[PDB]
Every structure is written in C-alpha cells, then in structure tokens.
C-alpha cells in the first residue's frame, strides 16, 4: 500500500508517486 522509492524501509510511501 504505497509508491515505493528507493529505500523499502520508510521511502515505501503514495506521497512519493
């Protein structure tokens, strides 16, 4: 459930797509 960016860890977010 998110946008994933480059790190997995806290990156994992839909703010970031």
Excluded at 7 to 12: E, Q
Aim: glycine share 6%.
């Amino acid at each position: 459930d998110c946008c994933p960016c480059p790190a997995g860890a806290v990156r994992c977010r839909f703010a970031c797509c």
